Symmetry: C7
Subunit: 266 residues, 7 copies
Amino acid sequence: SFWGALEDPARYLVTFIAFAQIAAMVAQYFSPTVKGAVILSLVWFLYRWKTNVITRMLSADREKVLTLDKVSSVGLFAIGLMASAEAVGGVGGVVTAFAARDILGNVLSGLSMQFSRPFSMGDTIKAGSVEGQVIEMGLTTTSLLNAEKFPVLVPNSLFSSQVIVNKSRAQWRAIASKIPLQIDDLDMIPQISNEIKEMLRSNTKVFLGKEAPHCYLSRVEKSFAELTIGCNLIRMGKEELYNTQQEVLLEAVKIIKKHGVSLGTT
Amino acid sequence: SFWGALEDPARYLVTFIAFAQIAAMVAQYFSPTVKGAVILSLVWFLYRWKTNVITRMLSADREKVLTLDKVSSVGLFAIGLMASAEAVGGVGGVVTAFAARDILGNVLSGLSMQFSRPFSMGDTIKAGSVEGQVIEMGLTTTSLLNAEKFPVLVPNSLFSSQVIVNKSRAQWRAIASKIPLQIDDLDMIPQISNEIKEMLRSNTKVFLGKEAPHCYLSRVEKSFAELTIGCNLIRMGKEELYNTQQEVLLEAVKIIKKHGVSLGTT
Amino acid sequence: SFWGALEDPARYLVTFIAFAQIAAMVAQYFSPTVKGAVILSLVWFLYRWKTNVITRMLSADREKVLTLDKVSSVGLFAIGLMASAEAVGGVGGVVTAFAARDILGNVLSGLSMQFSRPFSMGDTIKAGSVEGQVIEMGLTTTSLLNAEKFPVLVPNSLFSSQVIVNKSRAQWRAIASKIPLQIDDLDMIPQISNEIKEMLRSNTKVFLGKEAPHCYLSRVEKSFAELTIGCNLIRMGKEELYNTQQEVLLEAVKIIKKHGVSLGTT
Amino acid sequence: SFWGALEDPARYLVTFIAFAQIAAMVAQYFSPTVKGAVILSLVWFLYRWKTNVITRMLSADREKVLTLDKVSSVGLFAIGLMASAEAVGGVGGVVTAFAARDILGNVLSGLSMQFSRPFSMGDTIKAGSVEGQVIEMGLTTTSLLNAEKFPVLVPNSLFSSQVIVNKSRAQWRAIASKIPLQIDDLDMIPQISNEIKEMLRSNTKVFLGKEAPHCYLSRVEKSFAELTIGCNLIRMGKEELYNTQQEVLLEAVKIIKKHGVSLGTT
Amino acid sequence: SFWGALEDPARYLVTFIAFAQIAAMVAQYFSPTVKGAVILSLVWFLYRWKTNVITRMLSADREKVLTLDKVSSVGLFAIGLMASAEAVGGVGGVVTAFAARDILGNVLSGLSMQFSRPFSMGDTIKAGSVEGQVIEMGLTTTSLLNAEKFPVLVPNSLFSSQVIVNKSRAQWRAIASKIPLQIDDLDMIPQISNEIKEMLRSNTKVFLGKEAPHCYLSRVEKSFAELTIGCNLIRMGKEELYNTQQEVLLEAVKIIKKHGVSLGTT
Amino acid sequence: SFWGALEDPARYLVTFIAFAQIAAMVAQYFSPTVKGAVILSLVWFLYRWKTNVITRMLSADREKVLTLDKVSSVGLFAIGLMASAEAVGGVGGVVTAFAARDILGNVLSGLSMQFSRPFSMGDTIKAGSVEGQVIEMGLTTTSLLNAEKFPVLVPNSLFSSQVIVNKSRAQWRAIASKIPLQIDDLDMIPQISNEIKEMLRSNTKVFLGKEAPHCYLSRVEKSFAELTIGCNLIRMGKEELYNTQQEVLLEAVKIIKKHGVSLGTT
Amino acid sequence: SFWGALEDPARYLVTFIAFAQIAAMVAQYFSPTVKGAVILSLVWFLYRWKTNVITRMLSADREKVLTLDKVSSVGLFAIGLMASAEAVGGVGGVVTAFAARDILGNVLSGLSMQFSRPFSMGDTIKAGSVEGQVIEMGLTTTSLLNAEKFPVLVPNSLFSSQVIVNKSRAQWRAIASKIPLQIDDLDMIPQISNEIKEMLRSNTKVFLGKEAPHCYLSRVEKSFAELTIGCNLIRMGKEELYNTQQEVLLEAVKIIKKHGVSLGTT
Ligand SMILES: CCCCCCCCCCCC
Ligand SMILES: CCCCCCCCCCCC
Ligand SMILES: CCCCCCCCCCCC
Ligand SMILES: CCCCCCCCCCCC
Ligand SMILES: CCCCCCCCCCCC
Ligand SMILES: CCCCCCCCCCCC
Ligand SMILES: CCCCCCCCCCCC
C-alpha cells in the first residue's frame, strides 16, 4: 500500500534524473528540470497515497466523498503544475472551444425551444432516435419517459435542426388492417367491400372530413383474397383507440361471414 | 429546502478560498479572485433559492411561469458574470457562428423554396426521411401531416439540396400486380395474356399514352405459374385508384378462370 | 388577438429595461440599449399584429398573399435591425459561403452536364438514389418521372461525381431465368440443355455477337434440379422485351416436357 | 404570357423602391440602389420573356436550342450583374476551388491510371460499387457495360485509391458446390469422397498447381449429409466454364449414385 | 541474433553514405549529415540489440519489464534524435492538440457528469452502444458490467452529449404480451377482454395512476385471433417482475379457457 | 465530321464576341479578351478535329495510340492556355495537395509495411474489405488473389492503420460443429459427451496445449437435443484440415449411434 | 526487355522536347528544362532496366532482395530529383503531418495503455471490431488471437478512446436459457418454477451474491409454454462453464418431466 506508493515514483524519478545527467553530457537547463521532476514525482506520490487512503476509508456522506476526492485529485494535479511553473502550451483555446460548444450549444437550443415551442410537458414526442413522453423540460437537458417507462436524458442540442413528431397534437388518427379471405367465387367481393365501407360511415368515432374510409382488394391467390381496410378515427384517448380498433375488426368480420365467406390463412 | 440551498455553496466557497490561501503560499491576484468567488457563490445560492421557490409555487398563467423563470435563471447567471467582470474568453465567435448557421440557414432555405417552388399547400411530398401532406409553409419550419396523421415539424434547411418527390403533381399513375396460377398445360398461357391486355386497353381510366399495358409470365414451377400485370391509370383521386385496382384484379381473375384455369398457391 | 399581441412584447420590454436598470447599478451604455429595446419590442409587436391580420384575411390571389407577407415579415425584421443600428457580427461571410456553395454548385453542375452530356430528354437514368425518365433538364434542377410516375425534383449538384446508369443507350439486353425440374434420372440433363441452347440460337431477336446463350445446371436435390438459362436479346422496346421473355420461357418448357420430364417445385 | 412577365417584376420593383424610400427616412446610397434595382428588374423581366418565347418556339436543331438559351440565360444574368456594377463578394475562390477539385481530380486520376495501368479495354472489372466491361477509357470518364448491358459512366476520380478487382487477368478459376445426400449409413462417406477427388484429378480442364481438389463432409442430419466439392479450373472462356461446372456436377452425382446412395432434400 | 543486428544497419548506413557521396557530386551539408547518419545507425543497432536481449530474458517482475523496456525504447529513440540535433519540424502542436483533446475531453466530461449527475454507483444504464450496471465511476473512465457480466471500460467523453437511459430510476414498469386464440365465434371476444381488464385492476402490484390496463384485439384470421394485453406494474425488483409477468399470463389464460375458448397457433 | 467540328466553335465564338461588344457598351479589356476567345475557339476546334481523326483511324500499336492522343489532348489544352496567357487562379496548391496526399501516402505506407512487416509473399491475409493471397508486393499497390482467384489491386495506404488478420501464421486451428440428436431419455447425454471428449484426446492431429476439447449440450426440445463439439487441431495444410473435420464428425456420429441414439432433425 | 526499356522513355523525351521547342515559339527557361527532361528520362530508363534485371534474377536471401531493390528504386528516384534540382513544392509539411500522426499516435496510445492498463498478456478482450486473446503487447502494435486462432495485428491507436470489454477479469458469469413446454394445464406452472429455483440455489457453482436465480414464463401458445431460466455462476474455467450449463439444463428437464409435463416444439 504505502510501500509501492512511495517506491515506484521515487525509482522512476531517480531513473529520470540519471537519464538527464547523461543527457547533459551531449540544452543546459539542468536545475529547473530536476526541480520540476522532483515536485512532479512528489505529486505523483501524493496522488497514489490519496487514492490509497480513500479506498481505505471506503473499506469501512458517500457521494460527497467521491466528488470531494475527485476535485481534490484535479486540484492536487493543478497545484503540482503551478509548482512546476515556479521553477501553457496552447491547450486552453482548444478546451474552451470544446466546452463553449457543448455548454452554450445546449443552452442555445434550450432557449430556442422555449421561444418556438415544438412540444409541452406531457406530450409524446419522437425526435430521431428518442421517443416517449416529456416529463421534465430543463435548461440543458430534457427528460423523456420511453416505451418501457425508463427515464431518458436527452441534451437540448439534439433538438436543434431535427424533425420532431408530436403525437399528442393530432386531431384525428389513421387506422388500417388487412383481412385474409378463403373465398373461391370473387363475385361477392365488391358487395362485401361496399358493405364494409357503409359500416365505416354509419359508425360514430370516425372522421369523414378528409379521407373516405376504404376497403379494397390488395392481392389474390388460390382460395385466398386479402382486403385492406382503413379509416380515420376522431381524436380520442389510448383506450378508446384500442376498443375502436377491435370493434371495427369484429364488425368487418361479421359482415364478411354474413355473406357466407370464411376467413383465409396466411 | 432553504437549509441546503444556503449550506452547500457557502461551504464550497469557504473550501475554495481556503484552497486559494495555500495557493498564495507558493499569481498574486488574491483579492479579485476572492471577490469573484464570493459573488459567484452568491449567485449559485440565489439560483438554488429561485428554483426552490418556483417548485414551491408549482406545488400549488403556467407557460409564462416557465419561460419567465428560465429567462430569469439565464439573466441571473449573466448578471453574476457581469458582477465578476467588475472586480470574454472567445466563446462569442463560436456561438454566433452556430446561431448564424442554424437561423440563417433556415431562413435562406425558406426563401429559396419560395422562389423556385418545389410544392404548395396541400401537396403530398416525400423529402428523404419525411413524408406526408403539407399543412403549413412557414418562415423557418414547414409542417407536414404524416401517414398516421401526426403533425411533423421539419426545418426548412432539410429541403436545401435533397430530392423532393411530389406525389400530387402526377398526371398518370402506374399500377402492377402478380397473379399466381395453378395450371399444368401452359399452352393456354399466351392467349390468356393477350386477353388480359385487351381487357386493359378497352377499359377506360387507363392511359395508353406512353406505355402499353403488359401481362407476362415471370416464373414457373410445378402446377404453378405467375403473371405480372401492369398498366398506367389516368389522373384520379385516391378512392377511384383503389376501386380501379380492385376492378382490374377482378376482371383479370374472371378472364383467367374463364379459360378453365384455377388460381395457384404461394 | 390584438390584446396579447400588444401585451406580451410590452411586458417583456418593461421587464427587460427593469433588469437593465439594476444592471446599471453594478457598461454605461444605457440610452442606446433602451432605445434599441424599445424599437425591437415595437417590431415584435408589429410582427405579431401582421401575422394576426393575415390570418384574419385567410379566414375569409392566394400564393401572392403568402409570398408577400413572408417577404414583408423579413423586410420588417430587416428595417427593425436597421433602426437598431441607428441608435454586423460576422454572419455575412457564413451565409454568403453557404448560398454561394448551394447556388453556384447547382449552376456549375448544370453547365458541366451540358458540356459532357451523360443523358438527354426522355432517357431512363439511375443516379444513386434516384431513378426514372428525364422529363425536364433545367438550369438548377432536373426533373425525373420515377417508377410510380411521380415527378421527382433533383438538384444538378447530385450528378457531379456520381455514377449514372443510362438504361436508354443500351444496344442489347441480357435476360436470364431459372427453371426447376422434377427429374430422377439426370442422364437426360445434357441433351435438354443442348436443345435449349439450339432454341436460343435459331431464334431471332437474340444477339449472338458477344456471349453465347447458356443453359446449365446450377443445383441438384432429391427429385429436383435447376436450370439457369440466359441470353442477350437485340435492342427492342419494352413490350417486345416482355413478349420475348415469355416466348423464350414457354419454348424452354416445351423442350423440357418434350423429353418426358415434368417441372419441379421449390 | 407577356402580361405577367411584365407585371410581376415591375410591381416587385416599385414595392422595393417604395420600401427603400422609407428606408431612407431613418445609409445614404439612394440613387445607385434604385438604378441597380431598375436594371435588375429589367433583367428579370427579360429572363421571363426569354423563357416564354423559347417555350413558345418549343410548341411548334433541338439540342442546340437548349444549350443556346441556357448559355443565353446565364449570359443575360451576367450582363445584368455587370450593369449593376456600373452604377465580387468572395464567391470566386470558392467556385474555382470546387471546379478545380472536380475537373483536375478527374484529369489527374485519368493520367495516373494511364501510367500504372489497373485495366485495359475489354476487361471486366469491379471497383467498389461499379462492375462490368470496360468499353471506353476516356480523359475524364470511363465507360463500363454492367451486368444488364447498360452503359455506365464513371468519373476517373472514383478509381483513385480504391480496390480494383480485374476479372479478366485471372489464370485459373475456383469453383465449388454443395451436394445433399440421403444416406443413413455414413461408412460409405470416405470412399465416395476419395472417388470424387479422383474424378477431379484425372479430369482435364482442372488446375492442380496450387490447391488439391477437395470433397469433404460439412454437416450431418437425419437421413441427410452434405458434401462440399471444389477445385481450380484452368483459364477458359465463359462457356467452357459453365459446361465444366455442369460436367463436374453430373460426374459427382454419377459417382454418388453408383454407390447406391440417393440424393437428399433441403 | 547479434549478427544481423549489427549487420543490417551498418550495411544500410554505408549504402546511405555511398549514395550521399554521389549526391554531393551534383546542398553542401556533407559532414553533419554523415554524423547524423552515423549516430542514427548506431541507435538503430542499439534498438535491435535491446529487443534481442529482452526477448532473450523473456526466454528464461514481469509487467515492470515490459513497461521498462518500452519507455527505454522511446527514450533511446529520443536520445538518438537529440544527438542528431547536436550535429522540431512542427509535429509538436499536432500531438499536443491530439493529447489535449483526448485527455482534457475525458476529464471535462468526468467533471460535468459529477456536477449534473445522470447516474450513480449501481444504476443500470444504457448510453448509446454500451449498457449495463455502473460498478466504478472514475476520473477518466467509467466501468460498467454488461449483460454477460463482463467489465466494460467506457471513456467519460462518450457521455458528453448522448442520451442516457437510466433503468434504475423508474417508478413503474410497462409490461405487455400477445395471446393467440383459436376461436371461431368472435361474439365472446368483448366479454373476455372486459374480464381480463378486471383481472388487471383488482390485482395488486399494478399501477393505475396513469394508464388503464388494456386488452384489445389486434388481428384476426381463420380460426385465429390475437389479444394484446398490457399494464403498468409498480416499482419492484427483478424477481417480482418475472413472477408478476408469469402470474398475469396464467390468469389471462385461465380467463380465456374459462369461456370455453382454446388457444391458437402461429 | 469536319463540318460540325468547324461549325459549332466558330458560331459559339462569334456569339461570344457579339455578346462582348454590347458588354463593352455599358471593364475596358476588349482586345485581349477577343484574342483569347479566338485562340480558345481555335483550340476547341483542334480538339474536336483531333478526336475525329483518331476515331477515324480506330475505324481501320493500339494502347500507344490511346495514351498518345490522351497526352496530346491534355498538351493541346495546355498550349491553348499558355497562348491565352500571352495576350494561375490558385488551383495549383489544391492539385499538388491532392497528388501529394495520394502518391506520397501510398509510398509512405509501402515503406512502413516494408519495415514492420505485417505479411509476406504467399500469405493469406484479410485487411478490412479485402481478403486473399498476396501475389505481388509492390511500391504503390499490393496485389491479392481473392476467394474466386481474381487478381485484386489494393493501394498500400489501405494498410496504414487497419487491422490485418494473417491466416498463414497460425500455429493451431480451432474447429467446431453442432450435432442434432433425436433422443428422448437424456440420461445417456453425459456419458456420450465424455466418450466424445475421449475421442478428441486420444486422436492425433489435435492440440491439447491451451484448450481442452469440449462437447456440451447447448439446447433441448421435444425428441431433440444439440451437442456442440470443438477442439484445436495442430498446424496443417488445407487438405488435412478438411479430412480431419470429416474424420472427427464421423467418429462423433459413430460414438453417438453406438449408444443406440439416432440423429435428430432441424 | 532492354529494347522497350530504352525505347519508350527516349521517344517520350524527344516528343517532350519537340513540344517544348514550339512552346518556346510563343517562359524562356529552355536549357534547364531540357537538362531536367534529359536526366529524368535517364532515371526512368534506369528504373525500367532495374526492375527488368531484378525480375530476371527472380527467374533463377529472398526478402533482402525485395527490400533492397525497393529502397534502391526510391533512392534512384530521389537522386534523379536531386539531379533535377542541380539544373520543394510544399509536400513536406503534409507528409510529415501524416507520418507524425500515424507513428506518434501509435506510440502515444502504446504508452497510455502502459500507464492505465486496460488488459494484460493472456486476457481475452473485445475492442470494437476486434476480439480475442492478447498474445503480444508491442510498442506500436498489439497482437491478438481471434476466435479461429488466427493472429490479428491491431495498431495501438485503435485503443485510444474506445470501450474495451475484458472477459478475463469477470468474477461471476451470467447464464440463461429457454425451455419450451407442451403443457395444456398451466396450473402446474408455478410449482415447477419454484422447484427449478430451488434447484438453482441448493446447487454449488452458482453465485447468490447479487441476483437471485430466476425461472419465469415468458410466452404462451396452444399446447405450448416457454420458461426463461437464468442464474449467476461463480468464477470458473471454460470447461466447467460448459459442464455447468449442461448440468443445469439436464436438472431443469428432470424437474419438468418429473411433474408429468413433456417438452414442447418450436
Ligand atoms: C467545466 C466543465 C465543462 C466542460 C465540458 C465540456 C466537455 C468538452 C469535452 C468534450 C469534447 C472534447
Ligand atoms: C438565440 C438563440 C438562437 C441560437 C440557437 C442556435 C443554436 C446553436 C447551437 C447548436 C449547435 C452548436
Ligand atoms: C438567396 C437565397 C439563397 C441562399 C440559399 C442558400 C442556403 C444556404 C443555407 C443552407 C446551409 C446552411
Ligand atoms: C465550368 C464548369 C465546371 C465546374 C464544375 C464544378 C462543380 C462544382 C460544384 C460542385 C460542388 C460544390
Ligand atoms: C501526376 C498524377 C498524379 C496525381 C494524382 C492525384 C490525384 C488527385 C486527385 C484526386 C482527388 C482530388
Ligand atoms: C517513414 C514512414 C512513415 C510514414 C508513414 C505514414 C503514412 C502516412 C500516409 C498515410 C496517410 C496519408
Ligand atoms: C502521454 C501520453 C498521452 C497521450 C496520448 C494521446 C494520444 C493521442 C494520439 C491519438 C490520436 C492521434
